[PDB]
């Protein structure tokens, strides 16, 4: 009989337990931890944790179902290489944002900084949105982002420019943009008599001149509908220009009204920071207060290695000013990509370890935004994974993932070029006790590493808390080879199964849920990406505007009435010029031509026709113009060249010519 | 330890229990009800119900998981404002129908009366089908429907016309259509010698003249394939006109054959009822017998208020004949939108309460289809929700949803303009006991109210029973703002996340299931809406006909051979006229032009060309016609105006003119 | 509604089926038909789960018996048609790269036959032998489903190989020898090379010659003065299913064959394929063994099961484990002896046999061997058809039962076999045929997978408005694929299970662009009739200088429909500019016959320049230049008019 104390070997007791248990009946471990010399059939346990040393001296923990209140979700399913949520996730006004990079490789080729969002606490996720376009100088360089967050109602992001060839950092820019909001306000709008401007009082609006603002029911004439910020007075007040003026002062004190902001309608503010000295990557984001934030960084190109943060004390007035702070030099070797968060006046920082044979991930806290630090190192050379985290009560809750199976432990070699099932872990650390000696890494889910290339999209995620749940957004692969070694060295995502990397989210309960469940089974046709409705005629209909940028082959085509009170069908051609041409036919090239007709059929009885004959046609490059009237308006009918071509011929005579004078013969 | 008697305060015992048990342990309540002064961590309980007074003196009940044997499903996911299944759901020949309205707001703007269907007892749902088009007089008026059902194999619906400006009723029409069926029959067709009609015996066929009927293996010559109903003899007999005749009488007695009906291929029968006096909304549907049905209604625009039903005793012969029957006068104030159902000679009616500070939902039963009533009032002013229901055994099983969190209780004010989690309830009422004093509203699922606008799409649903399961189809939102106050006051569904309201279905066990589970996890690529197949050369191929009505941007386009034994590629343009034009270039505006070519390339060596130059071109509005022959057929070559334009010019001379006679001057 | 009950993994005898969903971890034994006990599992009694794996408008059925696992990927091949027949049929598959949790967009493996619609393809036998897919591709008539031709099609499977050495290149010549053990490649097959360390052996190449089973040569575009050898150096290859052609071996109309069905890999050289003959008497059931499919794909030997087991039998499933070939038949009729099981240690020359009790019929019994047990799956095609003597029950909707059973091969006795009903499907009932069942079985790791058909309640309207059986009208055809995933050994890892919460974005990959508009970057083919609204053709071609539309066929046609409201306005305006106003650009307007100005053409530009040819009337001495009310001002000529 098992003791469940986390020290006594219960392997034998649990083996007998399973043998006495009906085939496919579950053993309840009662929330206890059981020491084992081998992991048993974990699927036949509930409410059970195992402690096991795969490598002697390195105990790790393994959760059966129901031991933690949690669940894994798959959140993207796209042919791009979708990975690196690190470390960009945030929650804004009830919506969970999972930003990432969708590329074709571990590099910036075909890369768009992207996000998916959840509007239902993680149950379902949105169609991916591209946040960046391809760099103007693609394919020499392209964008990259591992640091993104919100400060005073604006999205802030460190948008890097990196080379395709080498992934070398060339530029850093701070990009920011107001977040979309709906506000229900009382008073705060004033408009002086006999002039057109109105002043809008909105505390911490976070808007700049030119940003979008929408007004409804303002009760101040002219302050209405889609508008823009004309001036900024201070952080709580701005003005707008109205189209009109009144002979009396206007004020809406005590009246309820609506505003009115937009991410989509407002431009990015882009602040070029140039080539920042001694930076390899900017990574992670911690909002400090109403004026600024910190971003993590490391330098791992030359000795000595740097790990720390950039603090932007006033990102609104001074986006180009930041303060570089480093962690103690003892912890900087063999470290990268710090995760940073700020709670109750304390800045916490956790490093990634570069290798399993050297001291790895370490934790740091600061009460002066990185000037001084208290530090500790995690045992057993934690490496290859970032450790995104949040603080809940006295605990830091951190998540990490090995990139391929059995790489987590100190001294464990990289195991690539073969399919495996990498373990994802979480751990708690009490901040009062400040001691990681006995930290317990709990394996809560396993991912797939594909093995077709050396690189892994598994892990390197990001963590957020919303209400009583914590969310770890991270990469995982599947068994579909990208055929980089094979027929797709070009890494085209749209061939075969594209790239196996996609995003996942582990949702874990971290406090009481005092409501009845919101959970549902998704049984709908997904109808947001390409919204389809069977029309009254039984034909699939897409009412959304769409862009098809890949090569298209179409069958029979009808252009419906669409434009100018639906009077006309319309096709517009872009570029410097448009070209409508005719392929060389397969079976009868001698028939190559296009018939243009003002009527419904190929018979010229249905309307006027012009037929352009191809060079392959029996009648090479012929043109036949066939109407019951040929009317040449606004210009002379001329030959292109001088004294080269004729009007008519001996076998094609015009009956006569109707003229206002004799011909001019020279 | 807790008593679980619904009367003893069990708060302290449950808190102690929760403290003493591991978080992954599901505390089993053994189906009992526990009185609490605050709701505990519900997620940690199984088979437990709580009774709690959020508002003193108003106890409500709260289900942990596995207390009711039910599950929530999401059943639509489209950008439209998808709400108001009220009260239209029905089951027909093994298929569950969930009709609704997909609009852009609480109103008729952009509205299509729609449905989704389930062919697997609610596990998965189909691509939305539009049942109505936009009204001929859109955007002044559009359709609206809250009453729909089936009577003798025909769909019947009250199709309303309402103004976009005010949502005011302008017209009521009864629309009906035969439902699609396949019948596998033996005998029943006769055809008299020397004439062409055949008589088809199908009891209660429900077809009218002109309705679609398909025949297979009839063994009666000429009764074959797609046909239509020629005459209707009576409710059990109709004729078809065949294309042929025989010399002896035909009768397929004893022979197996197939029919034959189609919703899609049959027209609506539309009966104009004008503007029915004293009606605000027609809502809910109760099939009475083989001949007719009732539809609920209320009048709430002027005083005094009316609530009742319209009975259509013989909708087949007399669709214009309806009988107005009100509920008792004292239950009409502050009431609307009655749900009606008919079971074993009893008509049941349940009202919606208009406000929480006045007597609300009431229940009524009648043994004479609404001529006389027995009535009861639900305690505590039930308001803002319809209460759709079914009868199973001795119990009415009713479902309701508050529109926003904490609105259910009597005296509870509306709580809008902030995100919340509205409670959905069900309750049983024993019809023998006929007393609602002790009714128990059980919170079984929570929805989301978004809060970006005052209106809520939550709830207002519909209920059906299929086999041993009850289904509540209803609205729910998510956290995605429609940006009505923001960049989308126009409420375009296809911008951003469109509208958050979508449909859900709660599926609850109400009787024994004598089969092994049909349950599956859905792991397929949804491939009905836009059916895609990777063809043998690895390109995504869509074989379905489609309509793309939204603005379309295309890249490189190839129009394949498609028409007249695939001899030609074809584009047809609709409207009064077609327009093919050229945008102003943004790189080189002075190059603006389109090249039309009878060959494969831009070089005129490949085929005859006509190039139309834009006004922005350096050669403003030039036309170059370039072929090896220019042949003008069927008409004179003329200038558009008289004595204004010339043939040739001083630097563009024709060599000569070949004429049958001298020029005619002037 | 009864409170839920834990049955503690026990089996209970009952005279009526109980409220099954009331129970957890319980099995019931019940004799629906007296003397024929069957077993019924409540939730959680079996460690297993059902998945829906296709959802397309085609009639998706007949995984039988083609499923296989290759290098971590589970393949579920099937036929997507419009009926029980070869009309509109493509041999297709879906795949899982996550141990059955999620499945891929359907891929068509075959096109329509060159002689469609007289004949089309059909396949019930597919598998892998030495890194090549092998399939028996049948040609059958649309009219009668009659077999006209059998062909063996084979193709190398896509692989990525991470190797060390094996590439040698002799000096002064270009051919390089590549050493890949059991490569299974032929001349012309695709090979990709990376980091070879041998000059010229690089990128996309093809096999030039095959020396033996372990060595082949490639032709490089260069040569070196010294010998080359990458022994001790790491490099990459390099194979492709899609970029290599099929090898097609015509076997003609194989005599006495109705269907080829099922696939058993024997060794590194060959395999067996099951068959039956059931159109003429006497019936045949057995296998075809291809001992050397690589050198001699046309060489096969016919092996029948014992004669007493051939009547009333079809569609054998065959598998090969540890020197023994196992075969299980499908029964034709419930009133005659049905499914039987056979084993052979000499590839079907001699057999040991047994009969399953109670006339098992209408189902194939695909299976695998796990330890001492055969684990087999079957499905009745409609509800209550399974039992001996049970009549077919079609033309009404029902819930057919799916079963599995174990059979210990040491005991070799099926008398006490326990068929366990693990899941129920839907049979729609709109037509007599059923897509339910007829599946395929694979094992991957500690899980067994049964891939099979099931329908839903949506009528195809064959009897109704869709006798043409067009999949793209209404809900198309109800048959789609499912997969039951059952645990068959310990799982010593933490769970990989997830809830799928993503937008499915493989079939039609959509991304909201930076302008907020849905964007599809994948190349696509739309073959169904398209109706389009406002269309903009974007710059795409020749360093994006131009927008481009190319028209195929013998000729292209751009025309104008007869207008509904104003037919007197029928025309198309072609414009070099942005708007309908001629101020924006040169215009040519072609008027329809319905227009007030019937078949008028107006050419409107600030220059009309006729290049490369005379301006001529089509006919001789019939039409004029100008008219009495449309005079040209003059004619500028190099010489006086030539007048008749
Ligand atoms: C949609 C459509 O048909 N647009 C055509 C318009 C259309 O008739 C509008 O109602 C405006 O007229 O007309 C265009 O053509 C004019 C002749 O109708 C245009 O050619 C002008 O016609 C003269 O008015 C005239 O005397 O009738 C005057 C100008 O010399 C002449 N201008 C030019 C540039 O030719 C139009 O663009 O307005 C053509 C268009 O397809
Ligand atoms: Na991917
Ligand atoms: Na919606
Ligand atoms: Na199907």
DSSP annotation string for C172-206:
T--EEEEE-TT----TT-EEEEBS-SSTT--EEEE
Q: Which residue has the tokens 């091949």?
A: C77
Same domain, A403 and A540: no
Residue that is written with structure tokens 């009966």 in the block: B271
DSSP string, B297-351: EEE-SSSSPEEEEEEETTTTT-TT--EEEEPPGGG-TTEEEEEEEEETTEEEEEE
Residue that is written with structure tokens 């890194």 in the block: C131
What are the respective helix, strand and coil percentages of chain A, to the nearest 5?
5, 45, 55
C-beta neighbour count of A297 within 10 angstroms: 30
CA distances from residue B494 to B103, B165, B480, B483, C183 in whole angstroms, order as listed = 12, 22, 13, 12, 52
CA distance B75 to B334: 32
CA distance from start to end of chain A = 120
The number of beta carbons lying within 10 Å of the beta carbon of residue A439 is: 16
Q: Which of A286, A290, A461 is nearest to A370 (CA)?
A: A286
Nearest Cα to Cα of residue A566 among C400, B578, B195: B578
Using the 3D structure, point to which of A230, A247, A266 is the last residue of a domain. Answer: A266
Give the CATH number for residue C172: 2.40.30.20
Give me the half-sphere count of Cα atoms (radius 13 Å) on the Cβ side of residue C348: 28
Name the residue at shortest CA distance from atom 40 of ligand 1.
C581
Looking at residue A7, which CATH number applies to its domain? 3.30.750.60
Q: What angle do CA C431, C436, C440 make, to 5 degrees?
A: 145
Q: What span, in angstroms and rounded, lies between the C-alpha atoms of A71 and A278? A: 41
Check: CB of residue A404 under 8 Å from CB of residue A420.
yes
Q: Determine the Cα–Cα distance for residues A553 and B561; give it in Å rounded to an integer.
A: 10
Two tokens, residue C211: 């020396």
Nearest to A558 among C97, C530, C639 (CB): C530
Q: Are residues A136 and A222 in the same domain?
A: no
- Whether the Cβ atoms of residue A476 and residue A439 lie closer than 8 Å to each other: no
Strand partners of residue C206: C190
**Taking CA atoms, what residue in C is nearest to B29?**
C3
* CATH number assigned to the domain comprising residue A591: 4.10.1090.10
Residue A131 structure tokens: 């946040």
Residue with tokens 């009577």: B151
Q: How many CB atoms lie within 10 A of CB A313?
A: 16
Q: What is the helix (H) or strand (E) element at residue B398, kind and residue range?
A: strand B395-401
Count of helix runs (H) and strand runs (E) in chain B = 1, 55
CB C383 within 8 A of CB B172: no
| Beta strands C636-637 and A189-191, pairing class | unpaired
Do A260 and A229 meet the contact criterion of CB atoms below 8 Å apart?
no
Atom of ligand 1 nearest to the CA of C584: 37
In the three-class reduction of DSSP (H, G, I as helix; E, B as strand; rest coil), residue B54 is classed as: coil
CA triple C527-C532-C534, angle to 5 deg: 150
Nearest 10 degrees: Cα torsion A476, A480, A485, A486: -160
Check B570 against C582: CB less than 8 A apart: no
Final residue of a domain: which of C431, C458, C490?
C490
Concerning whether C330 is annotated as a catalytic residue, the answer is yes
Claim to verify: residue A659 and residue A532 sit in the same structural domain: yes
- For strand B148-151 and strand B154-163, is the pairing parallel, antiparallel, or unpaired? antiparallel
- Measured distance CA(A482)–CA(A452) in Å, rounded: 7
The count of other CB atoms within 10 Å of the CB of residue C203 is 11
Q: What is the DSSP letter of A654?
A: B
Q: Are residues C454 and C548 in the same domain?
A: no
Rounded Cα distance, B5 and B7, in Å:
5
In sequence order, what are the residues at sequence separation of 6 or more whose Cβ sits closer than 8 angstroms to the Cβ of residue C205? C190, C191, C192, C193, C218, C219
C-alpha B295/C-alpha B158 separation (Å) is 8
Task: Report the alpha-carbon distance of residue A475 to residue A458 in Å, rounded.
Answer: 4
Q: Which residues have any ligand 1 atom within 6 Å of their CB?
A: A 633-634; C 573, 580-583, 587, 589, 604
Q: Residue C607 is inside which H or E element, if any? A: strand C607-611
Whether cis (ω within 30° of 0) applies to the bond prior to B87 is: yes
DSSP A537: T
Residue with tokens 């089926």: C17
Nearby residues of B480 by Cβ (< 8 Å), 6 or more positions away: A95, A117, A119, A126, B450, B496, B497, B500
Query: C577 is in which domain, residue-wise?
Result: 491-644
The angle at the Cα of B45, spanning B42 to B46, to the nearest 5 degrees, equals 125
A422 near A407, Cβ under 8 Å? yes
- How many Å separate Cα B631 from the centre of its chain? 57
Q: Chain C: residue nearest B539 by CA?
A: C524
Copy the structure tokens of residue C85. 């027949």
Helix (H, G, I), strand (E, B) or coil at B1: coil
DSSP string, A292-303: -EEEEEEE-SSS
Q: Are the CB atoms for C294 and C269 separated by under 8 Å? A: yes
Sign of the alpha-carbon dihedral angle for C425, C431, C433, C438: negative
CA distances from A569 to A521, A557, A596, C249, C560 (A): 43, 12, 16, 52, 10
Given the residues C132, C140, C283, C381, select the one marked as catalytic.
C381
Q: What is the dihedral of CA C164, C165, C167, C172, to 10 degrees?
A: 140
Min Cα distance A624 → chain C (Å) is 8
Residues B369-407: b if buried by 16+ CB within 10 A, e if exposed:
bbeebeebbbebbbbbbbbbbbbbeebbbbbbbbbbbbb
Q: Which residues does chain B have within 8 Å of residue A575's beta carbon, measured at their own beta carbons?
A: 585
Q: What is the number of structural domains in chain C?
A: 4
Does residue B549 sit in the same domain as residue B633? yes
Q: Which of B21, B45, B68 represents a domain boundary (last residue)?
A: B68
CB distance B451 to B420 below 8 Å: yes
Is there a single domain that holds both residue B372 and residue B307?
yes
Instruction: Say whether C567 sits in a helix, a strand or coil.
Output: helix
Quick one: C167 and C150 in the same domain?
A: no
Q: Phi/psi of residue C293, each to 5°?
A: -70, -20
Measured in angstroms, the resolution is 1.8
A634: alpha, beta or left? (left if phi > 0; alpha if psi -120 to 50): left
Q: Catalytic residue among A281, A306, A337, A477, which? A: A337
Own/partner contacts of A240-244, CB < 8 Å, gap of 24 or more, are A240/A197, A240/A198, A240/A200, A240/A213, A241/A196, A241/A197, A242/A191, A242/A196, A242/A197, A242/A198, A243/A196, A244/A196
Asked if C576 and C586 count as a contact pair (C-beta separation under 8 A), the reply is yes
Technique used: X-ray
Nearest CB to C637: which of B259, B625, B654?
B654
Nearest by CB to A133, from C514, C550, C609: name it.
Answer: C514
Helices and strands per DSSP (H, E), number in chain C: 0, 55
* Residue B579 to residues A502, B222, B505, C557, Cα–Cα distance (Å): 44, 48, 47, 15
Whether residues C450 and C503 fall in one domain: no
B474 & B599 share domain: no
Q: How far apart are CA A9 and CA A2, in angstroms?
A: 8
Q: What angle do CA C329, C332, C333 make, to 5 degrees?
A: 130
Indicate the SS3 state at residue A65.
strand
Tell me the CA distances in angstroms from C485 to C47, C133, C445, C593, one per residue in order: 9, 24, 12, 65
Question: How big is the CA angle at B163 (ends B160 and B169), to the nearest 5 degrees?
Answer: 45
Q: Spell out the SS3 assignment of C471-504.
A: CCCCCCCCCEEEEEEEECCCCCCCCCCCEECCCC
What is the Cα C381 distance to its own chain's centre?
Answer: 22
- A554 and B558 in contact (C-beta within 8 Å)? yes
Return the residue matching tokens 């409500």: B60
C315-327 CB burial, b ≥16 within 10 A, e <16: bbbbbbeeeebbb
Which strands make up the sheet holding B335-343, listed edge to edge?
Answer: B335-343, B346-353, B362-366, B374-377
Q: Which residue has the tokens 């308006």?
A: A633
List the alpha helices (DSSP H) in B6-100. 11-20
Closest-CA residue of chain A to C602:
A631
Q: Of B269, B603, C300, which Cα lies nearest the Cα of A579?
A: B603
List chains touching B (3+ CB pairs under 8 A).
A, C
How do B197-201 and B237-241 pair as beta strands? antiparallel
Place of tokens 């590329």: A103
3-class secondary-structure state, position B122: coil
| Tokens coding B306 | 């009316």
Sign of CA dihedral A302, A303, A307, A312: negative
> C-alpha A429: how far from its chain's center?
30
Contacts of A519 in chain C (CB under 8 A): none
In the sheet that holds C420-424, the strands lie side by side as C11-14, C27-30, C38-41, C420-424, C401-408, C373-379, C367-370
Q: Which residues contact B477 (CB under 8 A, 6 or more apart)?
A: B447, B448, B449, B450, B456, B457, B458, B500, B501, B502
Beta-carbon neighbour count of residue C575 at 10 Å? 27
CA distance B416 to B427: 26
Residue whose tokens read 């079971």 = B343
- Read off the tokens for B577: 């006229």
> Which numbered atom of ligand 1 lies nearest the CA of A633?
35
Q: Under 8 Å CB-to-CB from C28, ≥6 apart: which residues?
A: C11, C12, C13, C14, C17, C18, C20, C39, C40, C42
For residues B564 and A556, give the distance between their C-alpha atoms in angstroms, rounded to a whole number. Answer: 11
Q: Which distant-in-sequence residues (6+ apart) come within 8 Å of C633 by Cβ? A: A659, A660, A661, B643, B644, B645, B646
- Cβ–Cβ below 8 Å for B573 and C563: no
- CATH number, residue A130: 2.120.10.10
Interatomic CA distance for residues A71 and A112, integer angstroms: 29
Report the alpha-carbon distance of residue C444 to residue A125 in Å, rounded: 31
CA distances from A280 to A85, A100, A305, A525, B318 (A): 18, 18, 10, 44, 82
CA distances from A497 to A508, C106, C509, C579 (A): 31, 11, 12, 43
The answer to whether residues C343 and C483 belong to one domain is: yes
Indicate if B127 and B185 belong to the same structural domain.
no
Which residues touch A269 (CB under 8 Å, ≥6 apart)? A175, A176, A177, A208, A319
Peptide bond into C282 cis (omega under 30): yes
- Rounded Cα–Cα distance for residues A636 and B600 (Å): 30
* Buried/exposed code over C20-49 (b: 16+ C-beta within 10 A; e: otherwise): bbbbebbbbebeeeeebbbbbbbbbbbbbb
Residues B274 and B260 in one domain: no
- Per-residue tokens: A638: 């001329």
Contact B550 C533 (CB under 8 A): yes
Q: List the Cα angle B239/B240/B241 in 5-degree steps.
A: 130
Query: Omega into B472 within 30° of 0, i.e. cis?
Result: no
Q: Which residues of C touch B660 (CB under 8 A)?
A: 621, 643-644
Backbone angles phi, psi at B190, to 5 degrees: -135, 150
Of B379, B443, B383, B403, nearest to B39 by C-alpha is B443
């Amino acid at each position: 009989s098992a003791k469940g104390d986390g020290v006594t070997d219960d392997t034998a007791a649990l083996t007998s337990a399973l043998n006495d248990t009906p085939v496919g009946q579950k053993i309840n471990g009662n929330g206890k931890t059981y020491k084992v010399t081998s992991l048993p059939d974990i699927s036949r346990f509930i409410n059970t944790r195992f402690v096991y040393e795969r490598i002697p001296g390195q105990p790790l923990y393994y959760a059966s179902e129901e031991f933690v209140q949690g669940e894994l979700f798959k959140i993207t399913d796209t042919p791009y290489y979708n990975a690196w949520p690190q470390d960009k996730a945030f929650v804004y006004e009830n919506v969970i944002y999972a930003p990432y990079m969708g590329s074709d490789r571990a590099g910036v080729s075909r890369l768009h900084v992207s996000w998916v969002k959840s509007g239902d606490d993680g149950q379902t996720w949105s169609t991916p949105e591209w946040l960046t376009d391809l760099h103007p100088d693609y394919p020499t360089v392209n964008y990259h982002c591992m640091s993104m967050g919100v400060c005073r109602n604006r999205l802030f992001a460190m948008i890097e420019t990196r080379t395709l060839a080498k992934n070398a950092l060339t530029n850093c820019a701070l990009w920011d943009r107001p977040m979309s909001r709906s506000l229900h306000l009382t008073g705060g709008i004033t408009k002086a008599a006999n002039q057109r401007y109105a002043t809008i009082h909105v505390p911490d609006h976070g808007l700049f001149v030119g940003d979008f603002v929408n007004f409804s029911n303002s009760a101040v004439t002219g302050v209405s509908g889609d508008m823009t910020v004309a001036t900024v007075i201070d952080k709580d007040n701005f003005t707008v220009l109205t189209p009109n003026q009144q002979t009396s002062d206007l004020n809406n004190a005590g009246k309820n009204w609506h505003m009115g902001t937009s991410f989509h309608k407002s431009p990015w503010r882009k602040t070029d920071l140039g080539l920042i000295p001694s930076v390899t990557e900017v990574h992670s984001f911690a909002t400090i207060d109403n004026n600024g934030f910190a971003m993590g960084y490391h330098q791992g190109d030359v000795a000595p290695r740097e790990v720390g943060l950039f603090y932007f004390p006033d990102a609104f007035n001074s986006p180009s000013n930041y303060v570089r702070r480093q962690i103690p030099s003892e912890y900087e070797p063999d470290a990268s990509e710090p995760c940073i968060k700020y709670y109750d006046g304390v800045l916490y920082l956790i490093t990634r370890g570069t290798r399993g044979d050297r001291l790895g991930s370490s934790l740091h806290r600061s009460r002066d935004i990185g000037q001084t630090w208290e530090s500790l190192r995690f045992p057993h050379n934690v490496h290859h994974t970032t450790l995104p985290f949040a603080k809940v009560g006295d605990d830091l809750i951190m998540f990490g993932s090995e990139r391929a199976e059995n790489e987590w432990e100190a001294g464990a070699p990289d195991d690539r070029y073969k399919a495996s099932y990498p373990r994802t872990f979480y751990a708690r650390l009490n901040v009062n006790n400040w001691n990681a000696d006995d930290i317990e890494w709990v394996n809560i889910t396993d991912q797939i590493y594909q093995g077709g290339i050396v690189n892994s999209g598994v892990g390197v995620g990001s963590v957020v808390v919303k209400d009583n749940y914590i969310y770890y957004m991270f990469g995982g692969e599947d068994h579909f080879n990208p055929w980089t070694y094979g027929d797709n060295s070009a890494k085209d995502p749209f061939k075969s199964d594209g790239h196996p990397s996609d995003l996942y989210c582990y949702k874990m309960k971290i406090g009481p849920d005092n409501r009845v469940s919101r959970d549902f089974r998704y049984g709908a046709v997904p109808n947001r990406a390409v919204p389809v409705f069977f029309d009254t005629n039984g034909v699939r209909t897409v009412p959304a505007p769409m862009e098809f940028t890949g090569d298209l082959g179409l069958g029979h085509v009808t252009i419906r009435a669409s434009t100018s009170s639906n009077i006309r069908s319309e096709v517009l051609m872009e570029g410097e010029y448009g070209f409508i041409g005719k392929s060389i036919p397969t079976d009868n090239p001698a028939g190559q031509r296009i018939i243009f007709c003002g009527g419904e059929g190929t018979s010229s009885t249905t309307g006027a026709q012009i037929t352009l004959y191809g060079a392959n046609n029996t009648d090479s490059r012929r043109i036949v113009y066939n109407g019951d009237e040929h009317l040449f308006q606004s210009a002379d009918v001329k030959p292109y060249n001088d004294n080269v071509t004729a009007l008519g011929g001996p076998s094609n005579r015009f009956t006569t010519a109707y003229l206002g004078s004799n011909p001019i013969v020279t």
